[PDB]
Every structure is written in C-alpha cells, then in structure tokens.
Amino acid sequence: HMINAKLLQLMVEHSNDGIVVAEQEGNESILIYVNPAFERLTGYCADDILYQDCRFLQGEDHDQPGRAIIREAIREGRPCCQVLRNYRKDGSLFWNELSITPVHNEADQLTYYIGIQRDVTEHQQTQARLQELQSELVHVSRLSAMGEMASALAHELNQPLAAISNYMKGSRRLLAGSSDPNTPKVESALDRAAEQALRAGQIIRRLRDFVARGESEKRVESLSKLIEEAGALGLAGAREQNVQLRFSLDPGADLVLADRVQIQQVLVNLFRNALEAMAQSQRRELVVTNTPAADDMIEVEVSDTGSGFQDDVIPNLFQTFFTTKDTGMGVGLSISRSIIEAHGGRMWAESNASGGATFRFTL
Amino acid sequence: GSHMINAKLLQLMVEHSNDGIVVAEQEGNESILIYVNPAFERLTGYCADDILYQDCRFLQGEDHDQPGRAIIREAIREGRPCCQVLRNYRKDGSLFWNELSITPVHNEADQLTYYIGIQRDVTEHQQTQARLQELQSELVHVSRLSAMGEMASALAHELNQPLAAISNYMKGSRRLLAGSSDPNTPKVESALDRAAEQALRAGQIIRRLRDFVARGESEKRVESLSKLIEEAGALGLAGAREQNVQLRFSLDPGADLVLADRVQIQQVLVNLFRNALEAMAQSQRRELVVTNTPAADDMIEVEVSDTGSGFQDDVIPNLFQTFFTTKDTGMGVGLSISRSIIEAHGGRMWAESNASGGATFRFTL
Ligand SMILES: Cc1cc2nc3c(=O)[nH]c(=O)nc-3n(C[C@H](O)[C@H](O)[C@H](O)COP(=O)(O)O)c2cc1C
Ligand SMILES: Cc1cc2nc3c(=O)[nH]c(=O)nc-3n(C[C@H](O)[C@H](O)[C@H](O)COP(=O)(O)O)c2cc1C
Ligand SMILES: Nc1ncnc2c1ncn2[C@@H]1O[C@H](COP(=O)(O)OP(=O)(O)OP(=O)(O)O)[C@@H](O)[C@H]1O
Ligand SMILES: Nc1ncnc2c1ncn2[C@@H]1O[C@H](COP(=O)(O)OP(=O)(O)OP(=O)(O)O)[C@@H](O)[C@H]1O
C-alpha cells in the first residue's frame, strides 16, 4: 500500500465528515466504528450506540423512501447515496447526506459497510425556503399582471363608453321635442343602448374586482432580509455574467411597514431589468443601498451600469405597456410604482453617471 | 489510545469505498497527494502511479478562475475544514461536478499538516439543478403571458355582446330617422354616427391589447412525452416526495413522440400537477397516475388520475370556463388556457371523475 494504516486511521478519526463502519448481522448493520465527527453530528457517544443499527437516527420518522432504497441496496450488495431526515439526542432534526458502500471481507467471510455522512441541513433549509418564495412570487406576479391588464384596459376604454353615453343623452334631448311617429321607437332603442353601455362598464368593474381581490396587508419587514430574498431569486445569474454585487445596508433604517411579497416582487423585477440591461455591458455593477429619508421614511437605491435611458425614455418608464424589448410587457415598472405609492412612498427613476439606470423608492 | 476496529480493517473499508477518498501532505503551497483510493482513480481517470506526490489542481486545468479555488486556499491557509463543489476535468478532458470536503489535521508526531479529502461525483444533480433553474424562469415568463392573454380574450368575449348591441341600436335608429323632417334629425344622425364610430374604436382598442400581448411564436415540433413529462414533473411534483404521494408514469415508447409546443404543454402539465397535489392535501391515500395510449386520428392520449377530493356533481361542466374556481385564492384560468392550447394543437382536452373519488384529466395530441 501507500500509507501506514495508523496514519489512515488518524486521518479518519479527525476528519470533519462523519465516517462509520458497520458489520452485516442478519437484517441489522451494527455499527462497529464511528469517529468523533459522527459523535458531534449526532450528539451520541460511541460507547452508548456501538454494536447497534443506526435506524434510531430516523427515530419515529420511519416512512421515507431513503429507508427503502438503502435497505434494498444493502440486500442487493450495492453502494447507495441518499438524504435522510435524522433526529439527534435532544430530538432536533437535521438532514443527513449518506453514502453506504458494501464491502466483502474475504478473510473473515463477512460483509461490512462503510458510511460517509454529511450535514446538509442548512442547504436543504435554504433550498426549501427559496422554493416557497418562488411559488408565492409566481402567484403574486401573475395576479399583478392580471390586475394591471384590467386597470389599463378599463382606463383606455373609459373614453369611448363615456362618449357613447353622452351621445345617447344628447340625442334624447334633441328628440324630446319631436313629433315624428318613429321618435318613440328611436327613444326606446337609444335607452336600451345606454343601458348596454352601463352594463359594459359594470362588466369591466366585475372582472377588475374579481381578479384584483387580495389582502392589502402591511407589516414590519426587514429590508436586509427582503433584499437578500429578492437577490436570491432575481440575481441568480449574476456570477455567470460577472456582475459585481454590492449591498450597502443600514441597520438603523432596515425595518419598514410593507407587504413583503409585493416589495420582493418590485425588487426582483428591478434586478431582472438591471441584469438584462448589463448583458452587453463592459462594466456590470449592481449597487443596492438604503438610507433614511424625510417623513420618517426610508429610501432604497438600486444602481447599475447598463444600457441606461435614451433621452425621451425616462418620462415613459412608469406608463403601463411601455417597453423597449421585443418580447417585453412593460408592466413591471407600472405595477412597481403603484405598489410603492400604495405603501405610502414614491417610486421613481433617473439616469446615473455611468450610463446605466438608478431606481429609487421610499417606504 | 482507543481501538474499536483493527486499523487494517479500516484501511480495507477505505480502499473499497465508493466515494473518492484521498490524503495529502502540506509541502509549501502545494498539497501533494500521498494516498488515493480506487474510487478516486475511477472518478478522475488517473492512475495513482502517475499522479502521486503532486497537487490535484490539475483537475481544474485551464478552468483556473473559480470561487472554489479562493475558498479552498484560504481554508487551507487558515487551517480549517472546508466543503465545496468544483468543476474538474478527467484524463480524457471530460468535465464533471465534484463535491469535495477537505479536513486539515495537524499530526504532532510527524509535526506536519495532512489533509483528508472525501469527494463525490455530483454531476447529475448539478445538471438537474441548472435545468430546473432555466425552466422556472421560462415558466414564469410564459405563465404571466398566458394569464394576460386569457384575461384579454375573456374580457373581449364578455364585452363583445354589449358593443355589438350598441352598434345594432345605432344602425336601427338611423334606419328609423332616415326620411324624417324634424330639424334636429341631422344633428341626431351625426351624434349617432359618432357613437357608432366610438363603439368601433372600442373594439379596435380591445383587439390592440389582444394582439399586443398574445404576440409569440406558436411553433410546433416533435417532442418526446417522456422528456416533457419529466421536466413538468420536476417543476410541479417537487413536493410529491415529502407528501408521500405515489407517482406513477406509465409511458409507451411507441406512442411517445407528439407534435406540440413544448413550453405550452409544460405549463398545462405543471398546472395539472399542482391541482392534483392540492386535491390530495387532505387525502389519506395520495396516488397520481399518468398514462399514455394511442388514440384515433394518429393521436396520443395522456391521462392523469388522482385520489383527491375530486369534483362535486355540478363542477365538471364548469371546469373549462374562464374564471371558474373552487379556491378562495384561485384564478380559474389554468384549465381554460390549457384547453385552448390543446385544441390549438389539434387535440381535445377534457375531464372526468374516477372511481377513487379524485379527478382524471385526459388530452390528445
Ligand atoms: C454504514 C451505514 C451507515 C448508516 N448511517 C445512517 C445514518 O447516519 N442515518 C440513518 O438514518 N440511517 C443510516 N443508515 C441506514 C440504517 O442503518 C438502516 O440500515 C436503514 O435505515 C434501513 O433500515 P431497515 O431496512 O431496517 O428499515 C446507515 C446504514 C449503514 C450500512
Ligand atoms: C485532500 C485534498 C483534496 C483535494 N482534491 C481536489 C480535487 O479533487 N480537485 C480540485 O480541483 N482541487 C482539489 N484540492 C484543492 C487543490 O489541491 C488546491 O488546494 C486548490 O486548487 C487551491 O489551489 P491554489 O493553491 O493554487 O489556489 C484538494 C485539496 C486537498 C487538501
Ligand atoms: N434598469 C432599468 N430600470 C428601469 N427601466 C428600465 C431599465 N432598463 C430598461 N428599462 C426600461 O423599462 C421598460 C419597462 O421595464 P419593466 O420592468 O416595466 O418591464 P419589461 O422588463 O420591459 O418587461 P416585463 O414586464 O415582462 O418584465 C423596459 O422595456 C425598458 O424600456
Ligand atoms: N386537482 C384538480 N383537478 C381538477 N380540477 C381541480 C383540481 N383542483 C381544483 N380543481 C377545480 O378545477 C378548477 C381549475 O382551476 P385552474 O387550475 O384553472 O386554476 P386555479 O388552480 O384555481 O388557480 P390558478 O389559475 O391561479 O393556478 C379549480 O378552480 C377547481 O374548481
């Protein structure tokens, strides 16, 4: 061999990843060796748990498919890597990434197993949390798309329906002083037309209020937390695009009264727009900063080095459906501005000195 | 001074482990390999006799600049363990994903720093993670787009009848006023003409929005049902594992290729999977079956059955109408968009109750 066996055992004993060695006895794989790393990870003392099967790490959490795959791989005589939910001495849960390798010891005419085990609890937590944030943000983004669609369509349609109603009113005023035998039939037809216009407006508001229904809650929220959550969702691709991230956060100006999912979605949209504007940019730098502002408010600034704003673009940004992308919708900024203004702040934009875009809002 | 296993036995276990295990010796800024196991020779495609007593940075190669390198060196310098993931290349140049844990230990007797590295091939998991990360962004964009599109379509359909009634009323009123002698008749005719043109322009604005949002490639290509079912399951059936929901994909390779737009069928299936998982939230038996079969007109039928709360008696004929929902926070657009997409693709989408009290959806393509 290449190493003195004492050195190998020493390395195993002081390794940080849990290492155990077990002996096949019937339908039990009794532990015969554990290292102090495993004692730490499990909170169990070797003298207590030796020469038993490690199923008690599951405890009362019997039914998970990791158990089944591991058991059948053991019978089949094949290594297997899985993840399991294990409980420590004090009952606390952790996720355990486990590799079992079965080995046939010829000299003893026996089967042994070697198990390497890592604590993937923190990673599993953050991944599940991001899954939750992703699903909730998807639902809120489709909701806001529907809402701004209805609002813009209603506003654009308001003028023709009002013109029709006024025309019917004026025509009835003109025909009031008439003797033509058809005049009553005309009056009935025009009255029914006006009622149709009224019902069209009613249908507009019916759909508008059926989709835009939702709790307009406001709670104390940490800006650091929601900025990190929004970066986690929206700024995934920053590394591959070589985007420089800077979070300049102020702990004294960190708690605001807001609906966290709505500010999350405004920031996610800003981050996506900034990353897109810096796809062909030589300098790719994103700065997020919070500062105190007047009226006991807090101002958030997001600056990039992207393609920025053409001269006429800035005053159109917040209008619904204004877009510079061939496949863009132009609803993100309009919804964002309405959300910021509904929360008691004002959202607005400006060009920065680097040729990119800076967005600010207050809460 | 304890011994619970003969050290020879421990070496035997390490030698036959399936996870790569190496041991390295600190000699300056190079951590020379002094031990590798056959698992590592497999994973790396290198022979120990060739690579022994060298640093393993050559696994990165020309991929010099990665954050793993910075994290690892600072952890090595600091004398502290580290777990990372890296992109390494084998002997033949092929790439692989390597989950690597290094633990530095100071052995007093030799007065030296050694390292123990446990390493796994995490190639497939990283692949699936990147693939799901792309799909989620694509699904976000397309779901937002389809929501807006069906919103416009339904709003247009609901408004169409009143505006046509208004136009017909103006036409009939002009017919009545034709051949009249009241002096106000010309002014009334002008007003009614302008009202009719306003209704026309309202229809024009409706179609403006409908064609502005519904712009998009409606392409159709040959697609494997197994593949798109797996992508949709990866997105929609994430929580099936933890809810102990039994998933069954009964796919037939002879009836596997269809002509479809993959992103639209992806979003229909994602919605079906979410609906099926939701209907089995308060169900004790949670079983989801997907099945494909040949169908007439050179088509293929896909069935998705669950053991959920299913459909009340009057629910079935309302399912596909826009805005029909049984959820307090639901939108009721998923099934309407799905059916319009399937019919635009040449198939028929429909639903029925199954014998287990749940829901069965079928479509053809
Ligand atoms: C070497 C080795 C290490 C194991 N380590 C763990 C562990 O850390 N946590 C755990 O939950 N199960 C672990 N298992 C699996 C359990 O010991 C047990 O074999 C498995 O859950 C199947 O149990 P069953 O077939 O009796 O239901 C390990 C198995 C082996 C062979
Ligand atoms: C035990 C051990 C195993 C290692 N295995 C690998 C490996 O498989 N692949 C790899 O790219 N780097 C591996 N490294 C890290 C490299 O040896 C090196 O420390 C790292 O690339 C930093 O290189 P630098 O010192 O030039 O910055 C390992 C380090 C140790 C201590
Ligand atoms: N960094 C930026 N900040 C703000 N507005 C920007 C920025 N870069 C470009 N814009 C302009 O703002 C417009 C609207 O952006 P908004 O986020 O509202 O929607 P979008 O990104 O175009 O599309 P979608 O709503 O589908 O995300 C863009 O089309 C572009 O003209
Ligand atoms: N698993 C299910 N299978 C079939 N029909 C279901 C299921 N769950 C609920 N339904 C009924 O069918 C309707 C289909 O709704 P659809 O999937 O179109 O949207 P939603 O889930 O209500 O909301 P959203 O569109 O926002 O996702 C539900 O509103 C309900 O009436």
Side-chain angles (χ1 to χ4, degrees):
Chain A
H1 300 291
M2 323 163 180
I3 293 296
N4 188 280
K6 293 181 173 183
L7 177 57
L8 182 49
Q9 179 175 15
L10 173 69
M11 296 306 294
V12 163
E13 190 81 358
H14 289 113
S15 166
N16 187 30
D17 300 42
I19 302 189
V20 304
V21 172
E23 182 187 356
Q24 179 190 276
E25 297 285 50
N27 204 73
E28 278 83 346
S29 300
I30 56 172
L31 295 161
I32 64 181
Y33 171 67
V34 309
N35 63 340
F38 176 90
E39 291 189 55
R40 274 180 280 153
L41 164 64
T42 319
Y44 282 145
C45 202
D47 311 8
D48 296 321
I49 71 172
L50 263 169
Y51 309 135
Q52 300 193 307
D53 193 311
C54 16
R55 47 187 47 119
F56 53 96
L57 299 195
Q58 303 154 11
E60 292 282 34
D61 197 353
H62 297 45
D63 283 335
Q64 35 205 330
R67 181 180 197 266
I69 169 182
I70 284 156
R71 194 204 310 103
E72 260 313 300
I74 286 180
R75 171 213 165 259
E76 197 174 305
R78 287 195 318 92
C80 57
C81 167
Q82 268 281 288
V83 186
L84 279 189
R85 295 178 289 119
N86 285 146
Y87 306 118
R88 296 173 175 162
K89 185 163 182 171
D90 55 7
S92 67
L93 178 150
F94 69 103
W95 290 271
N96 179 9
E97 180 182 16
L98 154 77
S99 175
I100 298 158
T101 309
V103 185
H104 178 78
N105 178 202
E106 51 285 283
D108 259 322
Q109 274 300 346
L110 248 181
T111 309
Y112 292 99
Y113 311 105
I114 172 176
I116 314 175
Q117 310 167 167
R118 279 148 167 161
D119 188 12
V120 293
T121 289
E122 183 107 314
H123 167 272
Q124 201 86 336
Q125 288 298 81
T126 63
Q127 168 165 31
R129 188 267 310 143
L130 184 143
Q131 191 165 353
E132 141 192 294
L133 274 51
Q134 160 76 13
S135 199
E136 84 178 12
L137 200 71
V138 159
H139 203 256
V140 185
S141 199
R142 67 141 42 176
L143 176 154
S144 282
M146 301 286 218
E148 205 79 336
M149 170 54 73
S151 164
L153 188 150
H155 180 269
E156 212 110 0
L157 247 46
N158 197 302
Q159 175 194 65
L161 266 47
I164 294 189
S165 186
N166 292 341
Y167 281 162
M168 303 302 103
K169 293 148 167 286
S171 303
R172 226 183 173 276
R173 188 176 283 279
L174 283 181
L175 294 170
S178 188
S179 62
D180 195 331
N182 300 344
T183 286
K185 293 181 193 84
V186 176
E187 291 175 305
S188 284
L190 297 202
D191 260 8
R192 295 186 318 250
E195 90 180 353
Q196 286 279 357
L198 262 54
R199 181 177 181 170
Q202 273 181 27
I203 287 182
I204 290 290
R205 266 55 182 187
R206 181 179 180 274
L207 256 56
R208 163 205 195 91
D209 298 350
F210 163 83
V211 293
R213 54 172 164 79
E215 302 280 38
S216 64
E217 311 305 316
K218 314 281 158 121
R219 182 182 65 198
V220 183
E221 292 298 344
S222 36
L223 275 37
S224 175
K225 183 178 179 180
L226 52 76
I227 287 171
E228 166 189 304
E229 288 169 335
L233 278 173
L235 293 168
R239 293 182 183 174
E240 301 80 85
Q241 289 169 347
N242 298 128
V243 178
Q244 175 187 181
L245 292 179
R246 291 177 67 185
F247 302 152
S248 309
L249 305 181
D250 175 27
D254 198 68
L255 302 190
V256 175
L257 186 88
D259 187 336
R260 136 167 183 276
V261 199
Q262 292 186 354
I263 178 182
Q264 164 169 106
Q265 79 190 87
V266 311
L267 288 157
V268 162
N269 178 261
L270 296 176
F271 292 164
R272 302 296 248 273
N273 273 318
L275 290 182
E276 188 273 345
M278 299 185 299
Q280 314 298 98
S281 293
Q282 207 65 28
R283 290 184 158 178
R284 315 191 195 190
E285 295 167 10
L286 184 71
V287 184
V288 183
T289 306
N290 63 317
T291 300
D295 308 3
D296 290 78
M297 303 273 289
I298 287 162
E299 173 184 44
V300 175
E301 180 195 313
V302 40
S303 180
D304 65 48
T305 324
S307 55
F309 301 138
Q310 294 72 20
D311 302 315
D312 275 47
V313 171
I314 287 175
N316 299 38
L317 291 171
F318 296 100
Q319 189 188 336
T320 305
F321 300 132
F322 170 81
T323 316
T324 299
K325 299 170 181 184
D326 297 330
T327 45
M329 238 62 258
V331 293
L333 286 45
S334 179
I335 297 175
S336 71
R337 168 176 84 172
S338 59
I339 283 167
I340 297 300
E341 289 175 352
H343 281 64
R346 179 165 199 178
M347 186 183 179
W348 66 278
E350 182 197 355
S351 292
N352 57 46
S354 66
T358 290
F359 251 93
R360 304 179 191 269
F361 62 83
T362 56
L363 298 169
Chain B
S2 72
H3 255 213
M4 323 164 180
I5 59 174
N6 189 281
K8 296 176 175 181
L9 176 57
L10 182 48
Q11 181 177 28
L12 173 70
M13 295 305 113
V14 163
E15 190 81 357
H16 290 112
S17 166
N18 188 277
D19 301 40
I21 301 189
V22 304
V23 170
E25 182 187 356
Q26 146 146 276
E27 301 284 51
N29 197 353
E30 282 81 353
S31 300
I32 56 171
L33 296 162
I34 65 181
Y35 172 68
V36 308
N37 63 341
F40 176 88
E41 289 190 314
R42 275 183 217 120
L43 164 64
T44 319
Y46 280 144
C47 201
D49 310 8
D50 295 321
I51 72 171
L52 263 171
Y53 309 133
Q54 299 193 306
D55 193 312
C56 22
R57 63 232 325 172
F58 63 142
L59 298 197
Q60 302 154 10
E62 356 84 345
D63 201 1
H64 300 274
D65 286 70
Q66 320 179 39
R69 177 185 294 277
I71 297 179
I72 281 156
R73 211 175 2 128
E74 259 315 300
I76 286 180
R77 171 215 165 260
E78 198 174 306
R80 193 180 59 82
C82 113
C83 173
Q84 269 280 288
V85 186
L86 278 189
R87 293 179 288 118
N88 285 147
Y89 309 121
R90 321 219 153 152
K91 186 161 183 171
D92 56 6
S94 67
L95 181 151
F96 66 89
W97 307 89
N98 180 8
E99 181 182 17
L100 153 78
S101 176
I102 297 159
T103 309
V105 183
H106 179 79
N107 105 293
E108 316 169 344
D110 225 321
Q111 269 300 95
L112 261 183
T113 308
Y114 292 97
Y115 312 104
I116 171 177
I118 316 175
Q119 307 172 150
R120 329 206 195 193
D121 188 12
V122 291
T123 275
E124 292 191 359
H125 171 272
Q126 201 86 335
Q127 291 291 64
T128 63
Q129 168 167 31
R131 181 177 65 83
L132 182 143
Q133 198 141 354
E134 85 187 344
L135 282 59
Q136 268 300 252
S137 199
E138 85 178 12
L139 197 71
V140 159
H141 206 201
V142 304
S143 75
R144 200 150 158 272
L145 172 148
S146 281
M148 300 186 133
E150 205 79 337
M151 169 55 74
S153 164
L155 188 33
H157 178 269
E158 242 76 26
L159 277 185
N160 200 302
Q161 176 195 65
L163 267 48
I166 294 189
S167 184
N168 294 341
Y169 281 162
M170 304 303 104
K171 293 147 166 286
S173 303
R174 269 210 69 167
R175 189 174 283 279
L176 283 180
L177 295 169
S180 187
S181 288
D182 194 330
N184 299 342
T185 285
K187 291 182 192 84
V188 176
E189 290 173 305
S190 285
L192 297 201
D193 259 9
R194 295 186 319 251
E197 90 180 353
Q198 287 280 357
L200 225 63
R201 194 184 68 179
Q204 273 181 27
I205 287 182
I206 290 291
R207 265 54 183 187
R208 138 150 81 87
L209 255 56
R210 155 198 181 85
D211 298 350
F212 164 83
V213 294
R215 55 172 165 178
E217 36 231 38
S218 181
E219 312 304 315
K220 314 284 168 104
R221 179 60 178 163
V222 183
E223 292 298 344
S224 36
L225 275 37
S226 175
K227 183 170 110 135
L228 52 76
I229 287 171
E230 165 191 304
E231 288 169 335
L235 279 174
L237 293 168
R241 179 82 180 174
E242 299 77 19
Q243 293 167 30
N244 297 128
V245 178
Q246 175 187 90
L247 293 179
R248 307 257 209 86
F249 301 152
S250 309
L251 305 182
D252 175 27
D256 198 68
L257 302 191
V258 174
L259 186 88
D261 187 336
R262 129 184 177 275
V263 200
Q264 292 186 355
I265 180 181
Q266 163 169 307
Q267 78 190 87
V268 311
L269 288 157
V270 162
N271 178 261
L272 297 176
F273 292 164
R274 299 295 249 272
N275 274 347
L277 289 182
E278 189 181 345
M280 299 184 298
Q282 313 298 98
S283 293
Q284 185 56 261
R285 290 184 159 178
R286 347 176 66 165
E287 295 167 10
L288 184 71
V289 184
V290 183
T291 306
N292 63 318
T293 300
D297 308 3
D298 290 78
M299 304 273 289
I300 287 162
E301 173 184 44
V302 175
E303 292 184 344
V304 179
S305 180
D306 65 48
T307 323
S309 54
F311 293 111
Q312 294 72 20
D313 302 314
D314 274 47
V315 172
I316 187 173
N318 299 38
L319 290 171
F320 294 101
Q321 189 188 336
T322 305
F323 302 133
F324 170 81
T325 316
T326 299
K327 305 162 185 181
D328 295 330
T329 45
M331 300 293 297
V333 293
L335 286 46
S336 179
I337 297 175
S338 71
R339 168 176 84 172
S340 59
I341 283 167
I342 297 301
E343 289 175 352
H345 281 64
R348 176 167 197 178
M349 186 184 179
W350 66 276
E352 182 197 355
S353 64
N354 57 46
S356 66
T360 290
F361 293 94
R362 295 181 185 174
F363 63 83
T364 56
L365 298 169

